[PDB]
Swiss-Prot record, chains A, B:
Residues that bind acetone: T10, S79
Similarity-based family: Belongs to the AB hydrolase superfamily. Hydroxynitrile lyase family.
Keyword Lyase: yes
Gene that encodes the chain: HNL
Binding site for 2-hydroxy-2-methylpropanenitrile: T10, S79, K235
Protein name per Swiss-Prot or TrEMBL: (S)-hydroxynitrile lyase
Residues at the catalytic site: S79 (proton donor/acceptor), H234 (proton donor/acceptor)
The organism of origin for this protein: Hevea brasiliensis (Para rubber tree)
Length: 256, 256
């Protein structure tokens, strides 16, 4: 079967992270959309204009709004993109055939939206040469970050080629986790986000979303299906592109 | 010898085009700067804010201004980047050890700044699915363009891999040639631009800067040295990355 996949990058990244996976999925016959979220990739906004994870998600919500009735998509979110998935599913659940989590945060419905971010920060407290700043938007102080190049090399792009790490140095931008805004946000809903099918894809060789964190997330909120990819690194769409496409094909053949 | 190379992308592109060449040059021991010009790559401006090729060049001029006395660089410009080189050389000639033209426009000092652009448009009049628009800045009507995806595939990225063409689809932005603004600009100076050493690198298999154009430019304004790279495509920094690095090493060993 063919599907329409919507690929969702993590904070400080853009659609460009999907530059290897997108053509491979198209070579299987799928439709693929790879979005830039707000203040990401070549989006014209700067992060200081963005006040919440929901606002950050606007391009995804706008895209889903534009789908004609009856058309469903498979969302694929890497790393922090699982939060964009949850936000989207609480507006457009009927348009989502499934969500695939790709070394991603896996929010739940029982705890506040910041819960898995809070846990991540406990498991991985030291972001190396990442720099931080603060800005104010809608009366709240937001912590911005710019991912450190040592962190990128060693922990995110561990096994990627030098020309892929170079792209990350060139293209990663200032972003935010909006952790304190998530902490005050209404909970993700059971009828919306809780109802979607959730497929959790990961590698234990991930050097930022460590196994203790990922296995904790799987226990916390049981996925419908788990795929473990052997080897690779956090950026499986770069280091295990073929394996990710094969998994996504099977998801397209299972959920519609 | 080692050099400091400053890599300058073409219109509608960004530093990302250099993502393969930059690490290769660094693996030879060089320092490399790959800039985003105004309204390009992840630069925050939009093209409608930019009124001339000189304004478009601001990040290059600002970078050169920031070099301490005594430090010289080798400029490397692809495609329309030769115009940025000429602009820069008329402000900061003393900081330029040499300029390398990479399937690039080669402005002169005898004709108006638009001369080689006017010629390009005669040799290559049909930009396929490229779209055009107009905006006004500083009292002039500027023609903007967005490079067509068929033009990108067939003429710019002919022999590049699908994951490189994908990056171009994701990352190319609206831009301009500023052709009519160039046509009214004061001429490039003989003391400044005319004095710099100029190395012309090209392939005859280029599908947009066709051989008739490139050979016309070489005859029009004799380079100090010409290197012809066999095979490849317009994006030699993607299809002939190794060969470009070897040429640049020889330039570093010749001009300081």
């Amino acid at each position: 079967a063919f599907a329409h996949f919507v690929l969702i990058h993590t904070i400080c990244h853009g659609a460009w992270i999907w530059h290897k996976l997108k053509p491979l999925l198209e070579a299987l016959g799928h439709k693929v959309t790879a979005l830039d979220l707000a203040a990401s990739g070549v989006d014209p906004r700067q992060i200081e204009e963005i006040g919440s994870f929901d606002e950050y998600s606007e391009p995804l919500l706008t895209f889903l709004e534009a789908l004609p009735p009856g058309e469903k998509v498979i969302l694929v979110g890497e790393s922090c993109g699982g939060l964009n998935i949850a936000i989207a599913a609480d507006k457009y659940c009927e348009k989502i055939a499934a969500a695939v989590f790709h070394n991603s945060v896996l929010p739940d419905t029982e705890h506040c939206p910041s819960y898995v971010v809070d846990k991540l920060m406990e498991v991985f407290p030291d972001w190396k040469d990442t720099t931080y700043f603060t800005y104010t938007k809608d009366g709240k102080e937001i912590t911005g970050l710019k991912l450190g190049f040592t962190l990128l090399r060693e922990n995110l792009y561990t096994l990627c080629g030098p020309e892929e790490y170079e792209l990350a140095k060139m293209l990663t931008r200032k972003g935010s986790l909006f952790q304190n805004i998530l902490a005050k946000r209404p909970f993700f809903t059971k009828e919306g986000y809780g109802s979607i099918k959730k497929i959790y894809v990961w590698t234990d060789q991930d050097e930022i979303f460590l196994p203790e964190f990922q296995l904790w997330q799987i226990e916390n909120y049981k996925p419908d299906k788990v795929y473990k990819v052997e080897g690779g690194d956090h950026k499986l769409q770069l280091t295990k592109t073929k394996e990710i496409a094969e998994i996504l094909q099977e998801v397209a053949d299972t959920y519609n």
